[PDB]
Amino acid sequence: QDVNCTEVPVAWRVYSTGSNVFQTRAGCLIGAEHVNNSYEC
Amino acid sequence: SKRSPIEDLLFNKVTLCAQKFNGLTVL
Ligand SMILES: *[C@@H]1O[C@H](CO)[C@@H](O)[C@H](O)[C@H]1NC(C)=O
Numbered sequence: 001q002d003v004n005c006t007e008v009p010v011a012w013r014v015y016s017t018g019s020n021v022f023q024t025r026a027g028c029l030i031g032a033e034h035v036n037n038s039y040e041c
Numbered sequence: 042s043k044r045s046p047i048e049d050l051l052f053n054k055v056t057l058c059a060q061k062f063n064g065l066t067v068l
Contacts, residue, residue, distance in 0.1 A: 002066065026068065 001027040 005028040009017045015030055022029045042049065059065070 001068075002061070 003027055005030070 004023070005021060008030070017030075019031065020033055022032065022034050044052065
């Protein structure tokens with residue numbers, strides 16, 4: 001939450017960097033891919 | 042903006058910092 005995540009890996013490890021990283025208003029999410037479609041919530 | 046003239050007038054009157062400190066967050 002509320003963290004620009006070019007610098008998360010500063011503090012079981014795949015979820016710290018690498019793979020695909022996404023930027024949302026609340027923060028950013030690691031471990032999910034951002035599709036271009038729209039669905040029910 | 043996708044608002045209406047009345048909605049636009051309303052949103053321009055609500056107008057009256059506090060970014061983050063001492064564990065104060067706004068979701
Ligand atoms: C996040 O950081 C990168 C590089 O550190 C910068 O290019 C980007 O504009 C920043 N984004 C925000 C929302 O601060």
